[PDB]
């Protein structure tokens, strides 16, 4: 009875379908169906055995021994080996490959040194001891390492093919092979992606869908129309997006799903571009936002105002609902503005250098940017000009620091607060892009990773978070929800609360 | 990860 094709929207072309380069929710939406790591995420939101059938940990918690599952194969039928993992991780750490997620592998001994030119890749402590054994040594006991091994930077890639064709990842075809529940059988760039069930997947009997058809419709009204005609089985997040004005009606008819997730919506400042190089200007722009108005009137998705970096759903950080400063604090915003102008020798806001606010082309981002533009004009007398870019282009714009203020969202990679902080540890961190670094911040993050006590560790990270908010390299705006509607016959979808979605075991009733 |  239940159909076996799932029709969904992913809005736009992914940034990369190389797991070692992907850094974004669009790419990740695809790669989380097509690749599998040493571990995978089960329905309870916890890591479990995936490509590794056994995971051993040394007594000190630093050395991991993965036994590769008997008979695991790539989609072309070749065995998945430990050398595929070694190759992939070293590939992501090789500075020549310019992964923005190389820092995700710094947990491994020798990784940072290799990535920053202070060491050989040969001395990164990931080793295929044999075809079925991967040995990994960490700098510190990392209790969430098996969450990291399910993260897409830690996916294997087919070493044989990647050596043959260094552009293997750029198109569907015989040189694009993967090891997950689904495999990618078509990719029309900027059009659509077709995934089909992967008959070489080890746990294929648990996979019920035969086809996932992913379209790329960046018009939220159209996505909802297609859903309402039954041409899509889902409308909304994580991979699609509902029109903000539909949310009242859908909430009222009882069809809307709304779930808080570990994510934050912020405007990044290029702290090396005037006038955003002045902390008082950054603070004026941040304190002058009315986040309650944005979430009530603009987004309408039950998001909560963010005056902090770490989402309050992170155990130990629930007081971030209140945050580090007052929402809509125009009085204090104006005080910061005056202080900044004085430091420049200026008297009025209109004499500041021109400011551009950038975002990725999107119905909702444009509305938020317009609302913020008005708040800046009205509360500070600051005029900004707006510009928008395609998502995959936009990521590179921010990474190259070709911006002044840039909208971004960050979703948790793993269930620990440091994931919201360590992207800003190093100036040249692949996902930083603010030009900011602070020596005490970095010291505190590094100390956090040697502390096993959860209280003392949470306090080190809260101190770090306070330093970050005091230097305001980004303007927090809101903490995310996922909002969607779906065919209620679609069961078995895994949505862990970090904002990802897995269709591995999904089915129509 | 960066959210679209």
UniProtKB/Swiss-Prot annotation, chain A:
The modification Phosphothreonine is found at residue 434. One of its GO terms (biological process) is establishment of competence for transformation. It is found in: Cell membrane; Membrane raft. Its main location: membrane. Disruption phenotype: Inactivation of the gene results in a sporulation-defective phenotype. Disruption confers resistance to bialaphos. Transmembrane segments: none annotated. CDD domains: PBP2_OppA. One of its GO terms (molecular function) is peptide transmembrane transporter activity. One of its GO terms (cellular component) is ATP-binding cassette (ABC) transporter complex. SUPFAM superfamilies: Periplasmic binding protein-like II. It is a lipid-anchor. It holds the Pfam family SBP_bac_5. Keywords: Cell membrane, Competence, Lipoprotein, Membrane, Palmitate, Peptide transport, Phosphoprotein, Protein transport, Signal, Sporulation, Transport. Induction: Positively regulated by TnrA under nitrogen-limited conditions. Belongs to the bacterial solute-binding protein 5 family. The complex is composed of two ATP-binding proteins (OppD and OppF), two transmembrane proteins (OppB and OppC) and a solute-binding protein (OppA). OppA interacts with FloT in detergent-resistant membranes (DRM). Colocalizes rarely with FloT membrane assemblies. Part of the ABC transporter complex OppABCDF involved in the uptake of oligopeptides. Plays an important nutritional role. Binds peptides containing up to five amino acids residues regardless of their sequence, with highest affinity for tetra- and pentapeptides. Binds to the sporulation-promoting peptide PhrE (Ser-Arg-Asn-Val-Thr). Required for sporulation and genetic competence. This is Oligopeptide-binding protein OppA. The gene is oppA.
């Amino acid at each position: 009875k239940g159909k076996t094709t799932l029709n969904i929207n992913i809005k736009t072309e992914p940034f990369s379908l190389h797991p070692g380069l992907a850094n974004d929710s669009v790419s990740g939406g695809v790669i989380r169906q097509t690749f599998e790591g040493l571990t995978r995420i089960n329905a309870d939101g916890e890591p479990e055995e995936g490509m590794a059938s056994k995971i051993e940990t040394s007594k000190d918690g630093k050395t991991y021994t993965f036994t590769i599952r008997d008979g695991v194969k790539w989609s072309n039928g070749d065995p998945v080996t430990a050398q595929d993992f070694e190759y992939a991780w070293k590939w992501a750490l090789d500075p020549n490959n310019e992964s923005q997620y190389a820092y995700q592998l710094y947990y491994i001994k020798g990784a940072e040194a290799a990535n920053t030119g202070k060491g050989s890749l040969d001395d990164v402590a990931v080793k295929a001891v044999n075809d079925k054994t991967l040995k990994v040594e960490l700098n510190n006991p990392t209790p969430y390492f098996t969450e990291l091994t399910a993260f897409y930077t830690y996916m294997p890639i087919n070493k044989k093919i990647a050596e043959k064709n260094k552009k293997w990842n750029t198109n569907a075809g015989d040189d694009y092979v993967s090891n997950g529940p689904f495999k990618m059988t078509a990719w029309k760039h900027s059009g659509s992606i077709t995934l089909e069930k992967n008959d070489q997947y080890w746990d294929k009997d648990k996979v019920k869908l035969k086809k996932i058809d992913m379209v790329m419709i960046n018009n939220n009204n159209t996505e909802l129309k297609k859903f309402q005609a039954g041409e899509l089985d889902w409308a909304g997040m994580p991979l699609g997006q509902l029109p903000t004005e539909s949310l009242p009606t859908l909430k009222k008819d009882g069809s809307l799903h709304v779930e808080p997730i570990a994510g934050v919506y912020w405007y990044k400042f290029n702290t090396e571009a005037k006038p955003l190089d002045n902390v008082n200007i950054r603070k004026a722009l941040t304190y002058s936002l009315d986040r309650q108005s944005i979430v009530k009137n603009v987004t309408q998705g039950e998001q909560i105002p963010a005056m902090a970096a770490v989402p309050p759903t992170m155990k130990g950080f629930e007081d971030n609902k209140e945050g580090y400063f007052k929402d809509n604090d125009v009085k204090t915003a104006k005080e910061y503005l005056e202080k900044g102008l004085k430091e420049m020798g200026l008297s009025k806001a209109s004499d500041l250098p021109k400011i551009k606010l950038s975002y990725n082309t999107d119905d909702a981002h444009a509305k938020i940017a317009q609302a913020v533009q008005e708040m800046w004009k009205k509360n500070l007398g600051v005029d900004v000009e707006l510009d928008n870019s395609e998502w995959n282009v936009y990521i590179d714009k921010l990474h190259s620091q070709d911006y002044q203020i840039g909208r971004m969202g960050w979703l948790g990679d793993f269930n620990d607060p440091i994931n919201f902080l360590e992207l800003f540890r190093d100036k040249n961190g692949g996902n930083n892009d603010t030009g900011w670094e602070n020596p005490e911040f970095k010291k505190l993050l590094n100390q956090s990773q040697t502390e096993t006590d959860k209280t003392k560790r949470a306090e080190l990270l809260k101190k770090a978070e306070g330093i970050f908010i005091d230097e305001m390299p980004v303007a927090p705006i809101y903490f995310y929800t996922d909002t969607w509607v779906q065919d209620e016959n679609l069961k078995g979808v895994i949505m862990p609360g970090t904002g990802e979605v897995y269709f591995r075991n999904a089915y129509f009733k | 990860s960066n959210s679209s």
